[PDB]
Amino acid sequence: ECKGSPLVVSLIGALLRDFPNRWEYYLKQLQNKQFKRIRKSSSYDYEALDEAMSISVEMLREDIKDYYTDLSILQKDVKVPTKVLCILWDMETEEVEDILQEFVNKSLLFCDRNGKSFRYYLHDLQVDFLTEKNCSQLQDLHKKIITQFQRYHQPHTLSPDQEDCMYWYNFLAYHMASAKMHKELCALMFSLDWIKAKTELVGPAHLIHEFVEYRHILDEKDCAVSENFQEFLSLNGHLLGRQPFPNIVQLGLCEPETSEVYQQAKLQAKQEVDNGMLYLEWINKKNITNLSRLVVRPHTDAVYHACFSEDGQRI
Amino acid sequence: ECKGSPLVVSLIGALLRDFPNRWEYYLKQLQNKQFKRIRKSSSYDYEALDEAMSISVEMLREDIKDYYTDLSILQKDVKVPTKVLCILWDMETEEVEDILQEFVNKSLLFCDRNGKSFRYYLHDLQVDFLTEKNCSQLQDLHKKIITQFQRYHQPHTLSPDQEDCMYWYNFLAYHMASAKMHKELCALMFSLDWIKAKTELVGPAHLIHEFVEYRHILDEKDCAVSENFQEFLSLNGHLLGRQPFPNIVQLGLCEPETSEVYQQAKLQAKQEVDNGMLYLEWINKKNITNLSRLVVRPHTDAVYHACFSEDGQRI
Known part of the structure; x- marks a missing residue:
């Protein structure tokens, strides 16, 4: 947690001199991410680390000062391409x-x-201080950035060459969540073609990670839709990445029940069909396949051994 | 662009220390001609080159101060004979x-x-600063100088001996353009006799250069008139300069179609005719001559070789 700000270490360290027993407490406290709890009188000129940052912020000329806050939204650990900052700023x-x-x-x-x-x-x-001092705004701004992106590129209108886009895949998903706009979230993440492009250069892991975040954000009923999509992904991992990104629209019509993922597929197929494409319907799914929960291809070259993390978190 | 103001070079140079990548940007920036973009904190006592000039302007006593602005209109690189300054000032x-x-x-x-x-x-x-700081006035004043010249010499009333006149040929054409007065521009540049005197001591190149500027300034329909005149010039270059400035009024009645250049010629000829001058009409033009776009005589003495610039801009 300290992240090497020796000021934090001395600050925690002295703080412990008085109360050797309350060791975990401050651990969870920094897990909390609020620095108002940690204070010590010290040779250093400030009660606390939050105390230092406040002093730095003030100096900036009023015109600059507003801008920093926008800067607040950015992830703890993302090196964002300059452009996205251009877009938010306009x-x-x-x-x-x-x-x-x-x-x-x-x-x-x-x-x-x-x-x-x-x-x-x-x-x-630096990031933690921002949320500490800008949190009320952040939910509000989270909706500002998106609208600006809407004034420019649409997610389908996104392109591979543009520098900013990967941030846009990787994190645009992120902003809408803060926005708290769930219908817009449906306007983006649900889009199967968006999944297509994202799986084209991102791979099929980031989307799954987003989905777990996704489930809380929207609705329980949709959650099932997300459950249907995850089920649709189970078949994706094993062969999907290779290259000949087999016309998913055709390989999709294999799921059972119906949900929202299957409903999308049948209509797409009907649209394809009048034009051509010679899709072959499959009539036995409910009679066949005991689906595995997940499949992984790590290597184009034959596997020789694999092992669980002792924690079980990874393999 | 720097023009050796070491302040500009250090100013650009330091500016580049921070951003080696944005090299062209400042190039086009100085191509822009605005110095508000270039700024550096420096040992020197001013943010920028524009910053220095402002300090110089203030000192002048109020009576003098107004005059400098009039001085604004003058070309970047013209040594004007004192008189014209006398005329504007009155x-x-x-x-x-x-x-x-x-x-x-x-x-x-x-x-x-x-x-x-x-x-x-x-x-x-110095010139650039002026437009930077006096631009709104300049369009307005551009009309002030002309009226004063009207209170004195008329363009036909202009004479070869007077010192100022060449500036008047070379650049009077210029002021009217800023004036934005197109009817007055017709009152001057169109006048064929003005062309005569201008081609008498100026030569037949400056007028062509003026005409290109001329085309944007007036009207598209006139542009054709300008097209007809340029066509009338094509025949001018080859033999026109020599000396025996052949009575153009007679050699003019050779153009085709009609336009505004031919219309002028027939009437002039009719005016000449009653008095005398034994002009001979020509009846076959439309049946004869495949006109070349341009002709040049560089030398009274036989040509031996010629070559294009690699850029193609000159020969």
């Missing part, structure tokens, strides 16, 4: 970099000179 | 020089002791 790129350069000097946002591209990012402490 | 010559002498001391307008004549002129940076 301000031209040559200009946008320079304000950020001023920040980096303020040492409030670390630089990343990777090639022409720049990824700026924060310390875990 | 203030007597012995007096006019001295205020300018005070400027030269203010180092805001370089001196030119060429003979009795004086041509004052500016640095490219």
Whole structure:
């Protein structure tokens, strides 16, 4: 938790000198992520680590000051391509970099000179302070970024070449969740074609991870839809990644029951059918296949051994 | 672009230390001609080059201060004969020089002791600052100078001996354009006799250059008139300059169609005819001559070789 801010270590450390017994307490306290709990009088000039950050924020000229807060939304550990910052700001790129350069000097946002591209990012402490001091706004802004992206690229209108897009796959999903807009979340994550492109360069793991987050966000009834989709994924992992991304629209019409995943497939098939494509219907599914919960291909080359983590968290 | 103001070079140079990647950007930026974009904190006492000039302008006594702005209109690279400044000012010559002498001391307008004549002129940076700080006025003033010239010499009333006149050929054409007065522009540039005098000491190239500028300024329909005139020029270059400036009024009645150039010629011819001059009409033009787009005589002495610029811009 300390993340090497020796100020936190001395701050925890002294704090412990008084109460050797309450050892776990502060552990869970930093697990809490609030630094208001930790305080010590010290040679250092501030009660606490939260105390230091507040002093840094004030100096910025009023025009700059508002912008930092937008900067609040960004993940603890994402080096975002400059563009997305351009989009949220809606301000031209040559200009946008320079304000950020001023920040980096303020040492409030670390630089990343990777090639022409720049990824700026924060310390875990810097991020935590932000939520500590900007939390009420953040839910509100979470809806601001999305609308701006809507004023530009649509998710289907997204492209492989654009630098920002992967952030957009990987995390756009993320913003809508904070937004708390579930219908919009349906407008994005549900879209099977979005799944197609995401599985094209992302792979079929990120979507599953998103789905677990997804389940709380929307509705229990949909959760079943998510359950149907996860069931649709079980068949995806084994051969889906290879390359010849077999026309899923055709391999999809294999699920049972109906749910929302199957309903989508039949209609798509009907649409395909009049045009052509010679899809063959399958009539025995309910009579066949005892489905496995999951399948993995780690290697194009034959497997020789595998082992569980002792924790069981990984293999 | 820098023009050797080491302040600009250091200013660009430091500016680049931070962002080695955005190299072209500032190139086009200075191509823009605005210096508000370039800024660096520096040992030097000003954010930017625009910043320095503003400091110089303020000192001048209020009576002088208004005058400088008039000085704004002058080309980046023209050494104007003092007189034209007298005309715009409408203030007597012995007096006019001295205020300018005070400027030269203010180092805001370089001196030119060429003979009795004086041509004052500016640095490219000095000129750029002016438009940067006086642009709204400039369109307005552009109409002020012309009216004053009207209170004095008419373009036909212009003479070869007068010192100012060549500036008047070369650039009077220029002022009317800013003026945005197109009917007045017709009152000047169209006048064939004005073309005659201009081609008498200027040569037949400046007018062509003016015409390209001319086309945007007026009307598309006239543009055709300009197209007809340029076509009338195609025949001008080859033999027109020599000396015996053959009575154009007679050699003019050769164009085809009609346009505005031919219409002028027939009437002129009719006017000449009653008096005399024994002009011979030509009845076969539409039946004869496949006109070349352009003709050049560079030398009275036989040509031996010629070559295109690799860029193709010149020969």
